RNA sequence: CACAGGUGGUCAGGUAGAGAAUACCAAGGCGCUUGAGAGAACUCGGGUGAAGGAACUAGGCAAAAUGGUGCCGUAACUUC
RNA sequence: AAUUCCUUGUCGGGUAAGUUCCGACCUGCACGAAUGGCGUAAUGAUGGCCAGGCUGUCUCCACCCGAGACUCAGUGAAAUU
RNA sequence: GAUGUCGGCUCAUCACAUCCUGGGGCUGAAGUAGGUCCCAAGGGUAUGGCUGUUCGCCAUUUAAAGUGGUACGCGAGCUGG
RNA sequence: GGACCGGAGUGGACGCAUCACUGGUGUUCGGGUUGUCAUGCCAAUGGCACUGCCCGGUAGCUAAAUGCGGAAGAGAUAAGUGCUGAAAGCAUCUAAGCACGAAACUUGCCCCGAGAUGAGUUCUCCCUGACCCUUUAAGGGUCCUGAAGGAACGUUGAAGACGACGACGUUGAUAGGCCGGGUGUGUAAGCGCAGCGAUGCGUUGAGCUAACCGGUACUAAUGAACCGUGAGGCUUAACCUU
């Protein structure tokens, strides 16, 4: 989030446990990121029988954070941890077929919205 | 032509017409008077000399009091002056309270900031901190190196170092005007303004590039 | 660090130009006792602000 | 610095600040007149007067609360029964400070502090 | 309006519901469903009291499909519609933000009725 | 040096504890001969640092963290 | 390889990426069996590498407090020139 | 009759035989580029792996990841690998 | 696959301002809680063990927060583009002439700045002195007599290392206290009831309270005294018919 090289939990059915970020995308000489950013991410703790496999490299967006999301009105929406949605590296859009837990307004942006057709909480 | 004098009197956060929050600073602005207007021998053009506040005048000197007696026995607090051109401003009390900046969309508020004791030093200069472990000696916030070599054999002129604050004039420019109310001294501007509650300022039209 | 050449007596004299004793701009005088003092303080005769005070 | 954070540092932690002004307050209700340094007298008025203001309101809970200033069994019987009631007609200001300049030949600023309604006997010379 | 108090008192609500910490509440709130306004609801326990002037805000905590969730709500804002009390638990402290870590009296409670 | 140093042998209390450990505390002893202010950045030491979590640095060194008793439970490998 | 020249050698593993590390390789740098060879448990204020806990070491520098900094009275040196 | 380290940290500052940014010529300039080239010094300018490390090799991001001067820029400032 | 000037929205890098918001921190606020001592005891309250420990926290400070600024337009100009045009009866962007033209320059934006001794300019305020000796755009002595203002002191500050800077000192709300409000904390003590008791329940949405904020003369801000005064050197010009 404020730091780079960090573990994030999965929010979609493509894998399991944790995955690690390697960079934030958009802007330059950069280090700070949030739920509105795309990140580049690696497969660490997911099972190889899933949609993902060990040591593979994807894109993602963050969907929950322990710092929270504040800008919709000026007061915080908060969560119990840091979690992300897994996307194709070349063309974006989600690789998951099912999402679990709540979502954000930023999750309704054109490059990510295909997995939230089921209209989850806080969309 | 002129600015308008005021004071920072509070800061808050209020609702828009669509109900989301917007931050605002409350400014008291004081009603405009003109003490004389000056001849072309001063400034290079005409000039206009102005007052807004008043006080009990126990600590006001006769050099100042005879001038406020000339200006209609106003018992004035502060005295300011600007260039005059094209406009026909009056030589006496104009009583403009907010109306100079009621229709102007943004303002270039010149604040006076707040006193901070030491704030000519270190925190002023965003210097990278120094470690409490990894062997590091006698340092936590200090700059470390401050210059080049024996060849120039000097610290550079104007370089960052220690000093008192003692307060200073500052203009951030183009704050949005949210609300005004005449004869009740109200000017409301978006976001923060330089200085504390009780700090003096002058309001200007938007003049950025 | 240490000096590379010892200064003259003009240097010690010029560092000391800004120091003086008892710069009180005259004494106050107590109308109740005829004593002299420093301003807003008790006199040796105990008189202050129109009466005698601080005796034990 | 230290703007809009009113207080007095001078020496050790709040535990020492408490133990010193407890003792100086106890001495002031014992003697009703005290000689002490000016920055200590200027702080004592901020902690000894709220004790007298509590002493205007007699109860078991308030008289157990006064043990936070003085543990002495006679001063808790002078409070609420004389100290407090003897000021009930006044709008605070139960103490007054008298500034006596420096110690002779030295820096230390010296003052008297006393109770305002006491029996008078200090109407004589300072020397 | 007067530049002090009255300027901000004209933006306050005069009929705020009587909830406090340890209440389980339902909070109705506008979600802005694209180009038109729509109302939504949040349900959970109050973990912070609301008293700080025009800025008064409260905090409510719950779970959402296995994920832990919290929301801060602004009392006087038009986006917060209404609050209903579901249950009243005794939790003592003014703010319970340590309940993000401690389970003591988090899901088990004695009726407060205050 | 009226030096934040060194110096063989000896005896013991309440709450507490396994104890000559250890915190408060009794008896008894100490109040460390510049004195009084100030309330500065900074610097050394000390408490707290949202989110991340060694990305820092030669090196998680240092610091934080861990930290007990009883019972249950306990691997590679082994000279058993 | 506390031995290897050239060299950050060649291949496997961990990692997005490993001059290091750990495993494997060499028609063998100047390896070689009491200035002992190989190998195992327990031990080490032990050299190098790795996972977890947890952390202001850091991204990035924020607040609070003791002592010194600062003011004044007394006593008032030094290395150095 | 004193020369106490490079690479690094902090703090930087200057140059052009200009890294990027502004304008302009040429092209084997269709557009989009890429190559080339003139004028131009106001501002802006990465991150991570292995290494004591600049350099190197390697991965990633971006606008690009760039060259030279300054008791080898800087300990009476920081590391002492 | 694929356009520029111009217009609109927005991200990153960088700087600035603030403490309203969302967080942090908050040894001088409230509560919870462990060991132990004290107050004759119980109850309770106070001391000590890192601020003993834990959590919330007013005031203040502050980014991880929030708001704001990053160059328009005009002028001059380089490369260059261009018109008119010669030495060379012609041609050519150059020679004379002359249009257009960059992020550099000047102006425009921010801040300091008249000790800018080469001290700009306006406005307000104040003072009307003299004797004696001599050296006389002069100096000395002595006496009569003080203004504007400055200084000192107090109460002290969102001004501060010291100085400097701000408000108020009866032309009193300047500081402390008081009274009231408010933020914060979280239902106290005593009593009564319930229980064998830990402990609960009722009065009780209690009790306690700091730095914020309105009012308030209860407390604290004295007579002064001092420095500074006496209408301000010489000359030329203009104007006042002096």
From Swiss-Prot, chain A:
One CC-aspect GO term: cytosolic large ribosomal subunit
Function per UniProt: Binds to 23S rRNA. Forms part of two intersubunit bridges in the 70S ribosome. In the 3.5 A resolved structures L14 and L19 interact and together make contact with the 16S rRNA in bridges B5 and B8.
Keyword flag RNA-binding: yes
PROSITE patterns: RIBOSOMAL_L14
UniProt superkingdom: Bacteria
Outcome of swapping residue 98 to A: Reduced RsfS binding
Lineage: Bacteria, Pseudomonadati, Pseudomonadota, Gammaproteobacteria, Enterobacterales
Pfam families reported for this sequence: Ribosomal_L14
Cited InterPro entries: Ribosomal_uL14, Ribosomal_uL14_bac-type, Ribosomal_uL14_CS, Ribosomal_uL14_sf
Residue ranges crossing the lipid bilayer per the database entry: none
GO annotation, biological process: cytoplasmic translation
GO MF annotations, alphabetized: large ribosomal subunit rRNA binding; structural constituent of ribosome
Alphabetized CDD domains for the sequence: Ribosomal_uL14
Keyword terms of this UniProt record: Ribonucleoprotein, Ribosomal protein, RNA-binding, rRNA-binding
Annotated NCBIfam families: rplN_bact
Protein name: Large ribosomal subunit protein uL14
Family as reported in the entry's similarity comment: Belongs to the universal ribosomal protein uL14 family.
Organism (species): Escherichia coli (strain K12)
Alphabetical list of SMART domains matching this protein: Ribosomal_L14
Subunit structure of this chain's protein: Part of the 50S ribosomal subunit. Forms a cluster with proteins L3 and L19. Forms two bridges to the 30S subunit in the 70S ribosome, contacting the 16S rRNA. In pre-50S ribosomal subunits interacts with RsfS, which may inhibit association with the 30S subunit.
Curated annotation (Swiss-Prot), chain B:
Pfam families: Ribosomal_L3
Gene3D superfamilies, per database record: 3.30.160.810, Translation factors (2.40.30.10)
Protein family according to the UniProt entry: Belongs to the universal ribosomal protein uL3 family.
MF-aspect GO terms: rRNA binding; structural constituent of ribosome
Native source species: Escherichia coli (strain K12)
Biological process annotations from GO: cytoplasmic translation; ribosomal large subunit assembly
PROSITE patterns: RIBOSOMAL_L3 (PS00474)
Alphabetized UniProt keyword annotations: Methylation, Ribonucleoprotein, Ribosomal protein, RNA-binding, rRNA-binding
Protease keyword on record: no
Function, as annotated: One of two assembly initiator proteins, it binds directly near the 3'-end of the 23S rRNA, where it nucleates assembly of the 50S subunit.
PTM notes: Methylated by PrmB.
List of residues that carry N6-succinyllysine: 38
NCBIfam families for the chain: L3_bact
Keyword presence, Cytoplasm: no
Quaternary data: Part of the 50S ribosomal subunit. Forms a cluster with proteins L14 and L19. In pull-down experiments interacts with CedA.
InterPro entries given in the database record: Ribosomal_uL3 (IPR000597), Ribosomal_uL3_bac/org-type (IPR019927), Ribosomal_uL3_CS (IPR019926), Transl_B-barrel_sf (IPR009000)
Native organism taxonomy: Bacteria, Pseudomonadati, Pseudomonadota, Gammaproteobacteria, Enterobacterales
Positions where N5-methylglutamine occurs in the chain: 150
Leader sequence residues: none
The protein's name: Large ribosomal subunit protein uL3
GO cellular component labels: cytoplasm; cytosol; cytosolic large ribosomal subunit
UniProtKB/Swiss-Prot annotation, chain D:
Pfam hit, one: Ribosomal_L17
MF-aspect GO terms: structural constituent of ribosome
Record has Metal-binding as a keyword: no
InterPro entries, alphabetized: Ribosomal_bL17 (IPR000456), Ribosomal_bL17_CS (IPR047859), Ribosomal_bL17_sf (IPR036373)
GO biological-process terms attached to the record: cytoplasmic translation; ribosomal large subunit assembly
Keyword Phosphoprotein among record annotations: no
Keywords: Ribonucleoprotein, Ribosomal protein
Disulfide bond positions: none
SUPFAM superfamilies assigned: Prokaryotic ribosomal protein L17
GO annotations of cellular component type: cytoplasm; cytosol; cytosolic large ribosomal subunit
Subunit and partners: Part of the 50S ribosomal subunit. Contacts protein L32.
PANTHER family: LARGE RIBOSOMAL SUBUNIT PROTEIN BL17M (PTHR14413:SF16), RIBOSOMAL PROTEIN L17 (PTHR14413)
The protein's role, per its UniProt record: Requires L15 for assembly into the 50S subunit.
Family: Belongs to the bacterial ribosomal protein bL17 family.
Protein name: Large ribosomal subunit protein bL17
Gene assigned in the entry: rplQ
UniProtKB/Swiss-Prot annotation, chain E:
Pfam families: Ribosomal_L19
Alphabetical keyword list: Ribonucleoprotein, Ribosomal protein, RNA-binding, rRNA-binding
Disulfide bonds: none
Full protein name: Large ribosomal subunit protein bL19
Factors inducing expression: Part of the rpsP-rimM-trmD-rplS operon.
Gene Ontology cellular component terms for the protein in this record: cytoplasm; cytosol; cytosolic large ribosomal subunit
Subunit structure: Part of the 50S ribosomal subunit. Contacts L14. Forms two bridges to the 30S subunit in the 70S ribosome, contacting the 16S rRNA. In pre-50S ribosomal subunits interacts with RsfS, which may inhibit association with the 30S subunit.
Keyword Chloroplast annotated: no
GO molecular function, one term: large ribosomal subunit rRNA binding
HAMAP family in the cross-refs: Ribosomal_bL19
PANTHER family linked: LARGE RIBOSOMAL SUBUNIT PROTEIN BL19M, RIBOSOMAL PROTEIN L19
Family: Belongs to the bacterial ribosomal protein bL19 family.
Role, per record: This protein is located at the 30S-50S ribosomal subunit interface and may play a role in the structure and function of the aminoacyl-tRNA binding site.
Domain of life assignment: Bacteria
InterPro entries: Ribosomal_bL19, Ribosomal_bL19_CS, Ribosomal_bL19_sf, Translation_prot_SH3-like_sf
GO biological process, one term: ribosomal large subunit assembly
Stored Gene3D superfamilies: 2.30.30.790
